[PDB]
Nucleic acid binder design. Structure first.
Lengths: 118, 179, 165, 159, 178
RNA sequence: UGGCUUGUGGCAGUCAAGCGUUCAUAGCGACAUUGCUUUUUGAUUCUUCGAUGUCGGCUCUUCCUAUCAUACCGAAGCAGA
RNA sequence: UAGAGUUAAGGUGCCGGAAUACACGCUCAUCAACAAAAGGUGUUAGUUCAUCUAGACAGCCGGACGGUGGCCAUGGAAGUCGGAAUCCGCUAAGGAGUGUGUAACAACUCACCGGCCGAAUGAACUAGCCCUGAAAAUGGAUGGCGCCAAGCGUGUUACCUAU
RNA sequence: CCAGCAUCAGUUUUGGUGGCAGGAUAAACCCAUAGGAAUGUAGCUUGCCUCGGUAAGUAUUAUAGCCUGUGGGAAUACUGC
């Protein structure tokens, strides 16, 4: 598994996260077909709701450092089948539509502009 | 290399040459445990430690397994394993008596296929074979050992394997369910 | 005579058009196959089935290897990306003795006297360095003749060393 | 020069060049020439007759016990006086050290002119031949070729 | 010279015995069954020198006679070394008789004092190897008490040593207590 | 006659493209070869003229399994059979 | 023609005289004791390279998405026939697809890929010991005893050796 | 009368052990001193996580590679005794 892929992987997430402000970890706690894309269509523009291997993005949020801190206290949110959502489509609009669809199997929480919310 | 295996409060391990004993409330089980060079007679209070100097493919085999079977003997003598089979039959009602009353260290299968005869096998050590609740398909072994417990799966399976008529069509056969 | 007994050669050369009282017919159907066109054009890759030995590859097995590989290379295409050759010919007419018999016979047919191997077969010589089954095949993707050189050396006596050319 | 291989089993190509050595059975060895002539001799009969570079002491013990004439059995054994002086006298070589510094240097005389035999009968080497015998020549580890250092104690046994 | 054939290989004892018998020295070997020949139980099964296929039913009228016992192996084996052919050979054969069991109760050259070789160590060496007192069982070898009992006889010999033995020991002990 | 080779050739491994309903190997197998082997069927005067008398069968004196049937086992494109 | 002095060709576990020696090493199958096409998780070493805390790899655990039955062979073709375009989607992953399944839908699984875990793993290339291919008839019948080193290579040493 | 073999005393020839030396040479079983490059073990201190350890400083506890300069060691292939 080539490191030229993985190096530009965690580096790209840094650039996207420096550009944005807020974070919120998604809870993918067992789905069913159509309910995946029913999340996605309520966002649409520039959000972050794909997936991608956790070990790579574990390195991204650790080796962040925009000012002085990284994404502190983020690791107790992200373990198991989990996700993120950030980038530039407006803030609260992105945030509430995750937990529009995901009220059946709900989503988690995360630090919004980093003020810690749980 | 060398590995470590502990022993809890109400269990006493005692290896003494290759002869091992693990003690528990179900029974106390003996096997042997010693390959080439490897000395497992190193009792460091609680920790019984296997240790060898050499390595190699077939040699590393008897480094791990002597470590494994003392952990498996403590689970055997304390808790007790449950190895799982089922009596299956096609048409004819397969009839079984267990190691209690009639069975004096033997189990029996009669009316296997179309038997007027009987196919008989003994049983091993101190295995308390738990056949049925009221009536069940499942026979389930349990005893003080690990080896001798599921040896009563071997006993029972081989003696009435579907040989003289086909296994494919005729479904009188006591097959294994899972380990 | 299997091709075990069409291996070596104390059969010495004899092959000219002037001095010959007529050869028999051969099996040999076609030389170059797959591509006629591309020798080294489409094919910068080759495998030569280079002899270790100084054998006669008899005309029996010569057609055999070539026709197995002919029938095979129709699935991929009947003119796929290979160029299976025949090179060195049965120039030499293979001399083979018998009907023979000393005493107690039709006319007497000898063997010792009557040393002349009365021309029966045909054989090519495929000596050291030389090959018949030169397979100029393609660079990327479809190389098929590495497989088809098991199928070449089988219908050939001897232990040929596979060299990339 | 020495001799290693036996009397038998010699084709007419070795048989010609063995002729004017005048050498019968095994071990016995003559004193050959050295100019260009030595090359063609130890080219053909290289695996028959071996050679090497001996010292001064190496061919000193040799002409003592194996101290021959041609004609007449030897009265006085071969000292310095037994060559030149003594009762009668031979040619006129002085010591055994003058006899070695005769032949090895340039060789102004052959041994028949000094009134000895044409070859000299030697011995077998004490310490043996063994693996350095028939098997190969010098660069592997053989009897044949130019044994430079090794021919010292070898011929201080064959003496 | 009396030795003991106990707890080592068979051939690397037989060889050592032969050079001792050479002149006419009266070497008796005591125990054959507690030796060890090698081989499998598969290849070394069918064609083996007890009863299975070969050397038992292995005779004519004027012809061979073999064995089906772990006692008779070592007796037949050391005609098969020192033959009856030469005059010293047949003489040297009579100097040797092998015994099953240990009829001498005393300790001669046995375990600690023996010649070289013999007691091979199997570690990296040796998965498969037989034992003569296993191999001969379903060959016609019974009657264990008779031969196997011999061990019981060897025991009573030990006993004779241990006596009086025990006495001189108890004494020897008091000697050093001093 | 015996020896030798296996010529003339038998058997198997097997290159496995074809073709059998789809489908390299239930089966059928273009094209043939490599090792083994000594059976179809013979090449050779090696070893033999003070004997080298034949075939089918009766009768009675062996050993091996390249295996028909009896003990034991497994699989199918075989419903029990 | 004879007794000594020295050694070849070649031997020393034993029949039957001489090391049950010394040093290092793969391997212990009694290898040693014939055999090709053609083939292998025994078992060891060297070289080059994919691969690696920029989270290697396995097992266990998931997301199996919207456009959508993409399009077209064809009687029908359905991701799932043949052949080409080669994406959008949501831009921390799902290709216009790794394998199964029904004429086919109906049904199912997943490389690609996700999530636990946390260190050297894996392709080639080259060499050696092993290992598979190998059937016949009188009593060991590929040694008598038998040997796991008393086999063999490489390096060394001692003893024996032709009139 | 040749070969085997012969009292008793003295000596040669050939090879080795053991002690010693020359040709000719200096590595060693193991040999000085000064300056610069290096980097191993014990002990102490400081920092951080965790109950088990690790990183940094340590020339200021103790010791070394390899080169350069100066100075000092040095029995043996061959050959003889």
């Amino acid at each position: 598994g080539i490191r030229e892929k993985k190096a530009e992987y965690f580096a790209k997430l840094r650039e996207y996260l420096e550009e944005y402000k807020s974070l919120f970890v998604v809870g993918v706690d067992n789905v069913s077909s159509q309910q995946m894309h029913e999340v996605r269509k309520e966002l649409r523009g520039r959000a972050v709701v794909l997936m991608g291997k956790n070990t790579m993005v574990r390195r991204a949020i650790r080796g962040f450092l925009s000012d002085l801190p990284d994404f502190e206290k983020l690791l107790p949110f992200v373990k198991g089948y989990v996700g993120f959502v950030f980038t530039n489509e407006p803030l609260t609009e992105i945030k509430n539509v995750i937990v529009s669809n995901r009220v059946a199997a709900p989503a988690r929480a995360g630090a919004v502009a980093p003020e810690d919310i749980w | 290399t060398e590995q470590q295996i502990e022993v809890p409060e109400g269990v006493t391990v005692s290896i003494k040459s290759r002869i091992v004993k693990v003690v528990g409330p179900r029974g106390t089980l003996t096997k042997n445990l010693k390959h080439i060079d490897v000395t497992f007679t190193k009792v460091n209070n609680q920790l019984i430690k296997v240790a060898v100097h050499n390595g190699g493919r077939k040699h590393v085999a008897a480094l791990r397994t002597v470590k494994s079977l003392v952990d498996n003997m403590i689970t055997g003598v304390t808790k007790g394993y449950k190895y799982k089979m089922r009596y299956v039959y096609a048409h004819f009602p397969i009839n079984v008596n267990i190691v209690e009353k009639d069975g004096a260290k033997f189990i029996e299968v009669r009316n296997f296929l179309g038997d007027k005869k009987i196919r008989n096998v003994p049983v091993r050590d101190g295995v308390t074979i738990e056949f049925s609740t009221n009536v069940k398909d499942e026979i389930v072994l349990s005893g003080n050992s690990v080896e001798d417990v599921s040896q009563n799966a071997a006993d029972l399976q081989q003696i009435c394997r579907v040989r003289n008529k086909d296994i494919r069509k005729f479904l009188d056969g006591i097959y294994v369910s899972h380990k | 005579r299997p091709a075990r007994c069409y291996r070596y050669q104390k059969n010495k050369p004899y092959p000219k058009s002037r001095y010959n009282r007529a050869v028999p017919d051969s099996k040999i159907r076609i030389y170059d196959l797959g591509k006629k066109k591309a020798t080294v054009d489409e094919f910068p890759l080759c495998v030569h089935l280079v002899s270790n030995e100084l054998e006669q590859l008899s005309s029996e097995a010569l057609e055999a290897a070539r026709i197995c590989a002919n029938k095979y290379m129709t699935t991929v295409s009947g003119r796929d990306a290979f160029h299976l050759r025949v090179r060195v010919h049965p120039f030499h007419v293979l001399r083979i003795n018998k009907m023979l018999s000393c005493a107690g016979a039709d006319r007497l047919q000898q063997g010792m006297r009557g040393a002349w191997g009365k021309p029966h077969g045909l054989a090519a010589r495929v000596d050291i360095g030389q090959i018949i089954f030169s397979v100029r095949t393609k660079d990327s993707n479809k190389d098929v003749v590495v497989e088809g050189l098991r199928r070449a050396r089988y219908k050939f006596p001897g232990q040929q060393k596979i060299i990339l050319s | 020069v020495v001799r290693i291989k036996g009397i038998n089993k010699i084709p007419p190509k070795p048989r010609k060049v063995l002729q004017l050595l005048r050498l019968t059975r095994i071990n016995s060895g003559t004193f050959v020439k050295v100019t260009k002539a030595t090359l063609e001799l130890l080219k053909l009969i290289e695996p028959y007759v071996a050679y090497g570079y001996p010292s001064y002491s190496t061919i000193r013990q040799l002409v003592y016990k194996r101290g021959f004439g041609k004609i007449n059995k030897q009265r006085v054994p071969l000292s310095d006086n037994a060559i030149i002086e003594a009762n009668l006298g031979k040619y006129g070589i002085l010591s055994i050290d003058d006899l070695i510094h005769e032949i090895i240097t340039v060789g102004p005389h052959f041994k028949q002119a000094n009134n000895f035999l044409w070859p000299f009968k030697l011995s077998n080497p004490s310490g043996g031949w063994g693996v350095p015998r028939k098997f190969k020549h010098f660069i592997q580890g053989g009897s044949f070729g130019n044994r430079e250092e090794f021919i010292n104690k070898l011929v201080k046994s064959m003496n | 010279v009396v030795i003991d054939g106990k707890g080592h290989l068979v051939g690397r004892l037989a060889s050592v015995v032969a050079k001792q018998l050479l002149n006419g020295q009266k070497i008796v070997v005591v125990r054959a069954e507690e030796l060890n020949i090698s081989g499998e139980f598969f290849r070394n099964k069918l064609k083996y020198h007890d009863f299975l296929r070969k050397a038992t039913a292995f005779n004519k009228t004027r012809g061979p006679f073999h064995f089906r016992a772990p006692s008779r192996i070592f007796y037949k084996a050391l005609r098969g070394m020192v033959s009856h052919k030469t005059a010293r050979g047949k003489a040297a054969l009579e100097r040797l008789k092998v015994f099953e069991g240990i009829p001498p109760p005393y300790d001669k050259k046995k375990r600690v004092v023996v010649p070289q070789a013999l007691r091979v160590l199997r570690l990296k060496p040796g998965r498969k190897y037989t034992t003569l007192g296993k191999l001969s069982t379903s060959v016609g070898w019974k009657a264990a008490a008779a031969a196997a009992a011999a061990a019981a006889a060897a025991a009573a010999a030990a006993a004779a040593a241990a006596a009086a033995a025990a006495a001189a020991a108890a004494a020897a002990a008091a000697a050093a207590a001093a």
